Coordinates of C-alpha atoms in Angstrom, one line a residue:
Chain A
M1 CA 23.8 9.4 -1.1
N2 CA 21.7 7.8 1.6
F3 CA 18.0 8.7 1.7
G4 CA 16.8 7.8 5.2
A5 CA 13.4 6.6 6.4
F6 CA 10.3 6.8 4.3
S7 CA 7.4 6.2 6.7
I8 CA 3.7 6.3 6.2
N9 CA 2.0 5.0 9.3
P10 CA -1.8 5.5 9.2
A11 CA -3.5 4.2 12.3
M12 CA -7.1 4.5 13.6
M13 CA -8.6 4.3 17.0
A14 CA -11.9 5.3 18.9
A15 CA -13.5 4.2 22.1
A16 CA -16.5 4.5 24.5
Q17 CA -19.6 4.5 22.2
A18 CA -17.6 6.3 19.5
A19 CA -18.1 5.8 15.7
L20 CA -15.3 5.5 13.2
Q21 CA -15.2 5.1 9.4
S22 CA -12.9 6.3 6.7
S23 CA -11.7 5.9 3.2
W24 CA -8.4 7.0 1.7
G25 CA -8.2 8.5 -1.8
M26 CA -4.5 8.2 -2.7
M27 CA -1.4 7.6 -0.7
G28 CA 2.2 7.0 -1.5
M29 CA 5.8 8.2 -1.9
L30 CA 7.4 9.4 -5.0
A31 CA 11.2 9.6 -4.6
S32 CA 14.4 9.9 -6.6
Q33 CA 18.2 9.8 -6.6
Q34 CA 20.7 11.6 -8.8
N35 CA 24.4 11.7 -8.8
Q36 CA 26.8 12.7 -11.6
Chain B
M1 CA 23.4 5.0 -3.2
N2 CA 21.4 3.3 -0.5
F3 CA 17.8 4.2 -0.2
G4 CA 16.7 3.3 3.3
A5 CA 13.4 2.1 4.7
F6 CA 10.2 2.2 2.7
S7 CA 7.4 1.6 5.2
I8 CA 3.7 1.7 4.8
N9 CA 2.2 0.3 8.0
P10 CA -1.6 0.8 8.1
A11 CA -3.3 -0.5 11.2
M12 CA -6.8 -0.2 12.6
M13 CA -8.2 -0.5 16.1
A14 CA -11.4 0.4 18.1
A15 CA -12.9 -0.7 21.3
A16 CA -15.7 -0.4 23.9
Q17 CA -18.9 -0.4 21.7
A18 CA -17.1 1.4 18.9
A19 CA -17.7 0.9 15.2
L20 CA -15.0 0.7 12.6
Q21 CA -15.0 0.2 8.8
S22 CA -12.9 1.5 6.0
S23 CA -11.8 1.1 2.4
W24 CA -8.6 2.2 0.8
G25 CA -8.5 3.7 -2.7
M26 CA -4.9 3.6 -3.7
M27 CA -1.7 3.0 -1.8
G28 CA 1.9 2.4 -2.9
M29 CA 5.4 3.6 -3.3
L30 CA 7.0 4.9 -6.5
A31 CA 10.7 5.1 -6.3
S32 CA 13.9 5.4 -8.4
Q33 CA 17.7 5.4 -8.5
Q34 CA 20.0 7.2 -10.8
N35 CA 23.8 7.4 -10.9
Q36 CA 26.0 8.4 -13.8
Chain C
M1 CA 23.1 0.6 -5.4
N2 CA 21.2 -1.1 -2.5
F3 CA 17.6 -0.2 -2.1
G4 CA 16.6 -1.2 1.4
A5 CA 13.4 -2.5 2.9
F6 CA 10.1 -2.3 1.0
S7 CA 7.4 -3.0 3.7
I8 CA 3.7 -3.0 3.4
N9 CA 2.3 -4.3 6.7
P10 CA -1.5 -3.9 6.9
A11 CA -3.0 -5.2 10.1
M12 CA -6.5 -5.0 11.6
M13 CA -7.7 -5.2 15.2
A14 CA -10.8 -4.4 17.3
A15 CA -12.2 -5.5 20.6
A16 CA -15.0 -5.3 23.2
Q17 CA -18.2 -5.3 21.2
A18 CA -16.6 -3.5 18.3
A19 CA -17.3 -3.9 14.6
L20 CA -14.7 -4.2 11.9
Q21 CA -14.9 -4.6 8.1
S22 CA -12.8 -3.3 5.2
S23 CA -11.9 -3.6 1.6
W24 CA -8.7 -2.5 -0.1
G25 CA -8.8 -1.0 -3.6
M26 CA -5.2 -1.1 -4.8
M27 CA -1.9 -1.7 -3.0
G28 CA 1.6 -2.3 -4.2
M29 CA 5.1 -1.0 -4.8
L30 CA 6.5 0.3 -8.0
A31 CA 10.3 0.6 -7.9
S32 CA 13.3 0.9 -10.1
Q33 CA 17.1 0.9 -10.4
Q34 CA 19.4 2.8 -12.8
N35 CA 23.1 3.0 -13.0
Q36 CA 25.2 4.0 -16.0
Chain D
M1 CA 22.7 -3.8 -7.5
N2 CA 20.9 -5.5 -4.6
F3 CA 17.3 -4.7 -4.0
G4 CA 16.5 -5.7 -0.4
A5 CA 13.3 -7.0 1.2
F6 CA 10.0 -6.9 -0.6
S7 CA 7.4 -7.6 2.1
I8 CA 3.7 -7.6 2.0
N9 CA 2.4 -8.9 5.3
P10 CA -1.4 -8.5 5.7
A11 CA -2.8 -9.9 8.9
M12 CA -6.2 -9.7 10.6
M13 CA -7.3 -10.0 14.2
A14 CA -10.3 -9.2 16.4
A15 CA -11.6 -10.3 19.8
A16 CA -14.2 -10.1 22.5
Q17 CA -17.5 -10.1 20.6
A18 CA -16.0 -8.3 17.6
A19 CA -16.8 -8.8 14.0
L20 CA -14.3 -9.0 11.2
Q21 CA -14.7 -9.4 7.4
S22 CA -12.8 -8.1 4.5
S23 CA -12.0 -8.4 0.8
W24 CA -8.9 -7.3 -1.1
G25 CA -9.1 -5.7 -4.5
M26 CA -5.6 -5.8 -5.8
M27 CA -2.2 -6.4 -4.2
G28 CA 1.3 -6.9 -5.5
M29 CA 4.7 -5.6 -6.2
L30 CA 6.0 -4.3 -9.5
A31 CA 9.8 -3.9 -9.5
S32 CA 12.7 -3.6 -11.8
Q33 CA 16.5 -3.5 -12.3
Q34 CA 18.6 -1.6 -14.8
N35 CA 22.4 -1.4 -15.1
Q36 CA 24.4 -0.3 -18.2
Chain E
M1 CA 22.2 -8.2 -9.6
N2 CA 20.6 -10.0 -6.7
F3 CA 17.0 -9.2 -5.9
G4 CA 16.4 -10.2 -2.3
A5 CA 13.3 -11.5 -0.6
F6 CA 9.8 -11.4 -2.2
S7 CA 7.4 -12.2 0.6
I8 CA 3.6 -12.2 0.6
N9 CA 2.5 -13.6 4.0
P10 CA -1.2 -13.2 4.4
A11 CA -2.5 -14.6 7.7
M12 CA -5.8 -14.5 9.5
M13 CA -6.8 -14.7 13.2
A14 CA -9.7 -14.0 15.5
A15 CA -10.9 -15.1 18.9
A16 CA -13.4 -15.0 21.7
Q17 CA -16.8 -15.0 20.0
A18 CA -15.4 -13.2 17.0
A19 CA -16.4 -13.7 13.4
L20 CA -14.0 -13.8 10.4
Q21 CA -14.5 -14.2 6.7
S22 CA -12.7 -12.8 3.7
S23 CA -12.0 -13.2 0.0
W24 CA -9.0 -12.0 -2.0
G25 CA -9.4 -10.4 -5.4
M26 CA -5.9 -10.5 -6.9
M27 CA -2.5 -11.0 -5.4
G28 CA 1.0 -11.5 -6.8
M29 CA 4.4 -10.2 -7.6
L30 CA 5.5 -8.8 -11.0
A31 CA 9.3 -8.5 -11.1
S32 CA 12.1 -8.1 -13.6
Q33 CA 15.9 -8.0 -14.1
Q34 CA 17.9 -6.0 -16.7
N35 CA 21.6 -5.8 -17.2
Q36 CA 23.5 -4.7 -20.3
Chain F
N2 CA -23.0 -4.9 -14.0
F3 CA -19.8 -4.4 -15.9
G4 CA -18.3 -3.1 -19.1
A5 CA -15.8 -4.3 -21.7
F6 CA -12.2 -4.2 -22.7
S7 CA -9.9 -5.3 -25.5
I8 CA -6.2 -6.3 -25.4
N9 CA -4.1 -6.9 -28.6
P10 CA -0.4 -6.8 -27.8
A11 CA 1.9 -6.8 -30.8
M12 CA 5.3 -8.3 -30.0
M13 CA 7.9 -9.2 -32.7
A14 CA 11.6 -9.8 -32.5
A15 CA 14.2 -9.6 -35.2
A16 CA 17.9 -10.6 -35.9
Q17 CA 19.9 -11.2 -32.8
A18 CA 16.9 -10.4 -30.7
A19 CA 14.9 -11.4 -27.7
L20 CA 11.9 -9.9 -25.8
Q21 CA 10.5 -11.3 -22.6
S22 CA 7.3 -9.5 -21.7
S23 CA 5.8 -11.1 -18.6
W24 CA 2.4 -9.4 -18.0
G25 CA -1.2 -9.7 -17.0
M26 CA -3.3 -9.5 -13.8
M27 CA -6.5 -8.1 -15.2
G28 CA -10.3 -8.2 -15.2
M29 CA -13.2 -7.0 -13.1
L30 CA -14.6 -8.1 -9.7
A31 CA -17.6 -7.4 -7.5
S32 CA -18.2 -7.6 -3.8
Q33 CA -21.2 -8.5 -1.5
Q34 CA -19.9 -8.5 2.1
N35 CA -22.4 -6.6 4.2
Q36 CA -23.0 -7.5 7.8
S37 CA -24.9 -6.7 11.0
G38 CA -23.2 -6.0 14.3
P39 CA -23.3 -8.3 17.3
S40 CA -25.3 -7.7 20.5
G41 CA -24.7 -7.3 24.2
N42 CA -22.8 -9.4 26.7
Chain G
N2 CA -22.3 -0.1 -13.6
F3 CA -19.1 0.4 -15.4
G4 CA -17.4 1.7 -18.6
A5 CA -14.9 0.4 -21.0
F6 CA -11.2 0.5 -21.9
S7 CA -8.8 -0.7 -24.6
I8 CA -5.1 -1.7 -24.4
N9 CA -2.9 -2.3 -27.4
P10 CA 0.8 -2.2 -26.6
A11 CA 3.2 -2.3 -29.5
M12 CA 6.6 -3.8 -28.5
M13 CA 9.2 -4.7 -31.1
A14 CA 12.9 -5.4 -30.8
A15 CA 15.7 -5.2 -33.4
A16 CA 19.3 -6.2 -34.0
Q17 CA 21.2 -6.9 -30.8
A18 CA 18.1 -6.0 -28.8
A19 CA 16.0 -7.0 -25.8
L20 CA 13.0 -5.5 -24.1
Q21 CA 11.4 -6.9 -20.9
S22 CA 8.2 -5.0 -20.1
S23 CA 6.5 -6.5 -17.1
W24 CA 3.2 -4.8 -16.6
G25 CA -0.4 -5.1 -15.8
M26 CA -2.7 -4.9 -12.7
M27 CA -5.8 -3.5 -14.1
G28 CA -9.6 -3.5 -14.4
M29 CA -12.6 -2.3 -12.3
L30 CA -14.1 -3.4 -9.0
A31 CA -17.2 -2.6 -6.9
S32 CA -17.9 -2.8 -3.2
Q33 CA -21.0 -3.6 -1.1
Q34 CA -19.9 -3.6 2.6
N35 CA -22.4 -1.7 4.6
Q36 CA -23.2 -2.6 8.2
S37 CA -25.2 -1.7 11.3
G38 CA -23.6 -1.1 14.7
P39 CA -23.9 -3.4 17.7
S40 CA -26.0 -2.8 20.8
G41 CA -25.5 -2.3 24.5
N42 CA -23.7 -4.5 27.1
Chain H
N2 CA -21.6 4.7 -13.2
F3 CA -18.3 5.2 -14.9
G4 CA -16.5 6.5 -18.0
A5 CA -13.9 5.1 -20.3
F6 CA -10.1 5.2 -21.1
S7 CA -7.6 4.0 -23.7
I8 CA -4.0 2.9 -23.3
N9 CA -1.7 2.3 -26.3
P10 CA 2.0 2.4 -25.3
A11 CA 4.5 2.2 -28.1
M12 CA 7.8 0.7 -27.0
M13 CA 10.5 -0.3 -29.5
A14 CA 14.2 -0.9 -29.0
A15 CA 17.0 -0.8 -31.5
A16 CA 20.7 -1.8 -31.9
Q17 CA 22.5 -2.5 -28.7
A18 CA 19.3 -1.6 -26.8
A19 CA 17.1 -2.6 -23.9
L20 CA 14.0 -1.0 -22.3
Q21 CA 12.3 -2.4 -19.2
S22 CA 9.1 -0.5 -18.6
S23 CA 7.3 -2.0 -15.6
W24 CA 4.0 -0.3 -15.3
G25 CA 0.3 -0.5 -14.5
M26 CA -2.1 -0.3 -11.5
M27 CA -5.1 1.2 -13.1
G28 CA -8.9 1.2 -13.5
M29 CA -11.9 2.5 -11.5
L30 CA -13.6 1.4 -8.3
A31 CA -16.8 2.2 -6.3
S32 CA -17.6 2.0 -2.6
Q33 CA -20.8 1.3 -0.6
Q34 CA -19.9 1.2 3.0
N35 CA -22.4 3.2 5.0
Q36 CA -23.3 2.3 8.6
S37 CA -25.4 3.2 11.6
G38 CA -24.0 3.8 15.0
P39 CA -24.4 1.6 18.0
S40 CA -26.6 2.2 21.0
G41 CA -26.3 2.7 24.7
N42 CA -24.6 0.5 27.4
Chain I
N2 CA -20.9 9.6 -12.8
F3 CA -17.5 10.0 -14.3
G4 CA -15.6 11.2 -17.4
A5 CA -12.9 9.9 -19.6
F6 CA -9.1 9.9 -20.2
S7 CA -6.5 8.7 -22.7
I8 CA -2.9 7.5 -22.2
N9 CA -0.5 6.9 -25.1
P10 CA 3.1 6.9 -24.0
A11 CA 5.8 6.8 -26.7
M12 CA 9.0 5.2 -25.5
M13 CA 11.8 4.2 -27.8
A14 CA 15.5 3.5 -27.2
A15 CA 18.4 3.6 -29.6
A16 CA 22.0 2.5 -29.9
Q17 CA 23.7 1.8 -26.5
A18 CA 20.5 2.8 -24.8
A19 CA 18.1 1.8 -22.0
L20 CA 15.0 3.4 -20.5
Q21 CA 13.2 2.1 -17.5
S22 CA 9.9 4.0 -17.0
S23 CA 8.0 2.5 -14.0
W24 CA 4.7 4.3 -13.9
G25 CA 1.0 4.1 -13.3
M26 CA -1.5 4.4 -10.4
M27 CA -4.5 5.9 -12.0
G28 CA -8.2 5.9 -12.6
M29 CA -11.3 7.2 -10.7
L30 CA -13.1 6.2 -7.6
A31 CA -16.3 7.0 -5.7
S32 CA -17.3 6.8 -2.1
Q33 CA -20.6 6.1 -0.2
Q34 CA -19.8 6.1 3.5
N35 CA -22.4 8.1 5.4
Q36 CA -23.5 7.2 8.9
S37 CA -25.6 8.1 11.8
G38 CA -24.4 8.8 15.3
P39 CA -24.9 6.5 18.3
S40 CA -27.2 7.2 21.2
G41 CA -27.0 7.7 25.0
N42 CA -25.5 5.5 27.7
Chain J
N2 CA -20.1 14.4 -12.4
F3 CA -16.7 14.8 -13.8
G4 CA -14.6 16.0 -16.8
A5 CA -11.8 14.6 -18.9
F6 CA -8.1 14.6 -19.4
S7 CA -5.4 13.3 -21.7
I8 CA -1.8 12.2 -21.1
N9 CA 0.7 11.5 -23.9
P10 CA 4.3 11.5 -22.6
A11 CA 7.0 11.3 -25.2
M12 CA 10.2 9.7 -23.9
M13 CA 13.1 8.6 -26.1
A14 CA 16.7 7.9 -25.3
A15 CA 19.7 8.0 -27.6
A16 CA 23.3 6.9 -27.8
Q17 CA 24.9 6.2 -24.4
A18 CA 21.6 7.2 -22.8
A19 CA 19.1 6.3 -20.1
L20 CA 16.0 7.8 -18.7
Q21 CA 14.1 6.6 -15.7
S22 CA 10.8 8.5 -15.3
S23 CA 8.8 7.1 -12.5
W24 CA 5.5 8.9 -12.4
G25 CA 1.7 8.7 -12.0
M26 CA -0.9 9.0 -9.2
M27 CA -3.8 10.5 -11.0
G28 CA -7.5 10.6 -11.6
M29 CA -10.6 11.9 -9.9
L30 CA -12.6 10.9 -6.9
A31 CA -15.9 11.8 -5.1
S32 CA -17.0 11.6 -1.5
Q33 CA -20.3 11.0 0.2
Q34 CA -19.7 10.9 4.0
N35 CA -22.3 13.0 5.7
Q36 CA -23.5 12.1 9.2
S37 CA -25.8 13.1 12.0
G38 CA -24.7 13.7 15.6
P39 CA -25.3 11.5 18.6
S40 CA -27.8 12.2 21.4
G41 CA -27.7 12.7 25.1
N42 CA -26.3 10.5 27.9

């Protein structure tokens, strides 16, 4: 009856002369409850 | 009956001569409740 | 019957000669309740 | 019957010779209640 | 029957020789209640 | 350097009726925000 | 350098009726955000 | 350098009726975000 | 350099009825994000 | 350099009825993200 945790946690890091770029296409949940 | 936590937590970091750029396309939840 | 927490928490950081730019396309929730 | 928290909390930081610019396309909730 | 909190809290910071500029495209809620 | 769009909503009520229809956050936008990185200490 | 779109929603109620229909976050957008990296210490 | 799309939702209620229909996060977008890497210490 | 699409949802209620129908995160997008690597220390 | 698609959902309720139907994360996307490697120390 209870779902729980829905976590999307995107995080980026880089260091020490590194290079870092990105682009997200699509991201998301899609969730549902039934009871009868 | 209770959903829970819906968390999107995007975070960016970089250091020490790094480079960092980004662009998000689409992001979001899509959620629903039924009871009968 | 109770949803819970709907959290979008985007945050940006960078340090120490870093570079940081971004642009978001689309962001948002899309949520719903039914009971019958 | 009760939704909960609808939080968008965008925040920006950078330090120590960093550079930081951004532009948001679209942002927002889209939410709904039904009971019958 | 009760919604809850609808929070958009955009905040900007930067320090220590940093640079910081931005421009928002669109921002806002879009929310609704039904009961029958 | 954009295009075009057209919006004609038809909303009518009737006997013992009500419709609410809050809507609309729409258009097009363009962004010029390039930059160049800083230099050494 | 975009295209085109068309939106005609038909919403009608009737006897003992109500419709709410909150909608709309729509269009097109374009991004120029290139950069060049920093240099040494 | 995009295309085209068309959206005509038909929503009608009736006796002792309600429909809610929250919807819409839609369009097209384009991205220019190239860069060049930094140099030595 | 895209194509095309068409969306016509038909949603109708009736006696003692309700439909909710939250939907829509849709379109097309394109990405230019190439780069060149950094150099030595 | 894409194609095409068409989406017509038919959703109707009836007496003592409800349908919810949350849906939609759809389209096409293209990626330009090549790079060149760094050099020596």
